[PDB]
Design an enzyme around this catalytic site. Structure first.
Site, PDB file in Angstrom:
ATOM      1  CG  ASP A 112      41.431  37.086  44.992  1.00  0.00           C
ATOM      2  OD1 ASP A 112      40.460  36.932  44.214  1.00  0.00           O
ATOM      3  OD2 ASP A 112      41.749  38.209  45.435  1.00  0.00           O
ATOM      4  CB  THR A 142      43.298  39.103  34.586  1.00  0.00           C
ATOM      5  OG1 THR A 142      42.288  39.930  33.987  1.00  0.00           O
ATOM      6  CG2 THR A 142      44.451  38.963  33.602  1.00  0.00           C
ATOM      7  CD  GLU A 145      36.236  40.415  44.037  1.00  0.00           C
ATOM      8  OE1 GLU A 145      37.174  41.216  43.848  1.00  0.00           O
ATOM      9  OE2 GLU A 145      35.702  39.795  43.101  1.00  0.00           O
ATOM     10  N   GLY A 197      43.376  47.254  35.213  1.00  0.00           N
ATOM     11  CA  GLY A 197      44.361  46.418  34.495  1.00  0.00           C
ATOM     12  C   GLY A 197      43.817  45.831  33.204  1.00  0.00           C
ATOM     13  CD  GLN A 219      46.173  42.081  30.581  1.00  0.00           C
ATOM     14  OE1 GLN A 219      46.844  41.192  30.058  1.00  0.00           O
ATOM     15  NE2 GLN A 219      45.273  41.841  31.484  1.00  0.00           N
TER      16      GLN A 219
END
Ligand SMILES: Nc1ncnc2c1ncn2[C@@H]1O[C@H](COP(=O)(O)OP(=O)(O)OP(=O)(O)O)[C@@H](O)[C@H]1O
Ligand SMILES: Nc1ncnc2c1ncn2[C@@H]1O[C@H](COP(=O)(O)OP(=O)(O)OP(=O)(O)O)[C@@H](O)[C@H]1O
Ligand SMILES: COCCCCCNC(=O)CCNC(=O)[C@H](O)C(C)(C)C
Ligand SMILES: COCCCCCNC(=O)CCNC(=O)[C@H](O)C(C)(C)C
Ligand SMILES: [Mg+2]
Ligand SMILES: [Mg+2]
Lengths: 266, 264
Positions: free
Chosen positions: B6, B10, B69, B120, B124
C-alpha cells in the site's frame, strides 16, 4: 421600538424594528457593557434575547426581557429572511458558521440540530493569529483573499500522480499536506491564512453535504458572520457544495437570523 | 514469497507472506529504495494499491496486480478484525491517512460515505507551521502533554453562567480562545495538542455522523496517523464514546490495504 439581540461568543447582533423599518447593528461581544448601557437609555416596547451571552445582558439591564434558545431563534429568523428574499425552500440544511459551527435540518416545520463542529469563525481568527500575528479581523480576512494554497494543500492528484484516482484529482486530499514538500517554498501570511479559511470551509461544507444526504435534502443554507468580508470562505463553501450536487444559499443579513428570530418567537 | 504493498501519500506499507507474515513501513519519499528492494526479489505474487502504486509498477522490472485502495483496505481490515477476535456485523471505518476516507461496511462490502482533508497530513503540515518541527516522532511526542485550555473555546465559555443547549464541556471553537489569551505563551506543545485536537474532533464528528446515517454503532479507526500518537487515539476514542458509539483500533490496522491487496 422592538429589539432582538443575538449575543454570541464573538459578535452581538442587534435588530431594531420600528413600523417595519429595520436597523441591523453589529457590536463586539467584548463591548457587551456598551450594549447594556445603550439598552438602558432606549425606549423599548419589547426586548428579546438569545445566544450564549444573553444572560450577561439580561442580568445588567433595567427592563424585563424574553430569552430564547438560539437554535430555534436562528431557524425562525432565517425562515423569515428566506421568504422575504424569494426562496421558497420545502426543506434544507442550515449551517450556522459563527464562532463555532452548528448544523440544522429544517423539515419545512421545525429545526433539529443534526451536528456541529469547532471549525468556524473562531478558528479563522485564532489559528489565523497564531500563523500571522494579525488580531484585526478586517486586516486578517483581507490578507487571506490574496493567498495561494497550492504550496500548502495536497490534492488527490498529487497523491495519485500519473494514475487514475478513485475520486476526482482536483479535490483536497490533505489540508496543509503539501507543506513538508515545499520547505524551501514560502509560507507567507496570506498563503497560510487562505489555507486556514480553506480547511474551515471544506470541513463545514463536508459536514453540511453529509447531513444533507442523511436527511434527504439538496438545499444547504449558510449563515453566520464568518462570511462577512470573506469572499474566499463564501467561494470555498459555494464551489464545493455545488461539486457535491447540492444547492448553496447565502442570505442577505443571514448573520442576523437569530436576532430577528428572537423578535418573532412566542 | 507473496507481497502486498500500500503505497500511500506519506508511507509505504509492505506485507510479506511466506508460509509467516512480516510488516514493514517505509517513507513514500524513499519509494526508490522500495523499488530497488523489489527488483532483487523473487516474488511469486505481487499486489499493489494506493496513490503511489503506479510509481512502483512503472519502475519495477516484474508484473504486478493493482487494486483500488478502498476495496483493499476493507478486505484487509476484515481479515485483521477476525484475527483479533472481533465479530462485527457492520461498521463505519475511518482511514486516517495523509487524508481521511470514511466507509460504511454492511457485513458484505464497503461503500465510501465520505472524506475530509483533516488527517495525518494536516497534523504534520500545520504542526510544522506552528512549531518548525519536521521530524514526525519529535512532532507527535511534543504534542502529548500540551494543554489546549488557552487555545480552544468550550461551549461553557460562550454560555458563561447560563445553561447551554448542548453540553458545556464540548469544544465550541478550536483555536477560539487564542484571542482571549494574547498575554499567554502559546507553547509548541500546547499548539500541537490543539492541532491534534481539531483533527481528532473533525474525523470523529464525521465518523459518528455517518454511523448515525447508516445505523451502526461500530466505528473502526485505522491509518498510520494513530502511530506514536496516544493523544489522537484518546481524543477520538473519548468523543466517539460520548456520542454513543463504540470505537475500535486494530493491531496493524495501518496495513489493512497492503494485506487486502494480497487477498483480493
Ligand atoms: N467585525 C468583526 N469582528 C470579529 N469577527 C468578525 C467580524 N465580522 C465578522 N467576523 C467573523 O464572524 C465570526 C463570528 O460569527 P457570528 O457572529 O455568526 O458568531 P457568534 O454568534 O458570535 O458565535 P456563536 O454563535 O458560536 O456563539 C468571527 O469569529 C469572525 O470569523
Ligand atoms: N514514520 C512516520 N513518518 C511520517 N509520518 C508518519 C510516520 N508514522 C506515522 N505517520 C503519520 O501517518 C500519516 C500517514 O498515514 P497512512 O500511512 O495511513 O497514510 P498514507 O497511506 O501514506 O496516505 P493516503 O492513504 O491518504 O494516501 C502521516 O501523515 C503521519 O501523520
Ligand atoms: C470535547 O469536545 C469534543 C468536540 C465536539 C465538537 C462538537 N462541537 C459542537 O458541536 C459545538 C460547535 N459550536 C457551536 O455549535 C456554537 O459555537 C455554539 C454557540 C456553542 C452553539
Ligand atoms: C477542492 O477541494 C474539495 C474539498 C475536498 C474534501 C474531500 N476530500 C476528500 O474526500 C479526499 C480526502 N482524502 C482521501 O480520501 C485519501 O487521502 C485519498 C488517498 C485521496 C483517497
Ligand atoms: Mg451565533
Ligand atoms: Mg493510505
Amino acid at each position: 421600538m422592538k429589539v432582538g439581540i443575538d449575543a454570541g461568543g464573538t459578535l452581538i447582533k442587534i435588530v431594531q424594528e420600528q413600523d417595519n423599518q429595520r436597523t441591523f447593528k453589529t457590536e463586539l461581544t467584548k463591548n457587551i457593557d456598551q450594549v447594556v448601557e445603550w439598552l438602558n437609555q432606549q425606549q423599548i416596547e419589547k426586548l428579546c434575547l438569545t445566544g450564549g451571552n444573553a444572560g450577561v445582558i439580561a442580568e445588567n439591564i433595567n427592563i424585563p426581557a424574553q430569552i430564547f434558545v438560539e437554535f430555534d431563534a436562528a431557524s425562525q429568523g432565517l425562515g423569515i429572511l428566506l421568504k422575504e428574499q424569494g426562496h421558497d425552500l420545502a426543506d434544507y440544511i442550515f449551517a450556522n458558521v459563527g464562532t463555532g459551527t452548528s448544523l440544522h435540518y429544517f423539515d419545512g416545520q421545525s429545526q433539529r440540530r443534526v451536528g456541529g463542529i469547532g471549525t468556524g469563525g473562531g478558528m479563522i481568527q485564532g489559528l489565523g493569529y497564531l500563523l500571522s500575528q494579525i488580531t484585526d479581523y478586517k486586516q486578517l480576512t483581507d490578507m487571506a483573499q490574496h493567498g495561494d494554497r497550492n504550496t500548502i494543500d495536497l490534492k488527490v492528484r498529487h497523491i495519485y500522480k500519473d494514475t487514475e484516482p478513485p475520486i476526482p484529482g482536483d479535490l483536497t486530499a490533505a489540508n496543509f499536506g503539501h507543506v513538508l514538500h515545499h520547505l524551501d517554498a514560502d509560507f507567507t501570511p496570506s498563503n497560510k491564512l487562505a489555507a486556514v479559511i480553506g480547511v474551515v470551509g471544506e470541513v463545514v461544507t463536508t459536514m453540511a453535504i453529509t447531513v444533507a444526504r442523511e436527511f434527504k435534502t439538496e438545499n444547504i443554507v449558510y449563515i453566520g458572520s464568518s462570511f462577512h468580508n470573506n469572499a474566499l470562505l463564501r467561494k470555498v463553501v459555494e464551489d464545493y457544495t455545488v461539486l457535491r450536487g447540492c444547492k448553496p444559499y447565502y442570505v442577505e443579513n443571514g448573520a442576523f437570523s437569530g436576532a430577528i428570530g428572537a423578535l418573532y418567537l412566542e
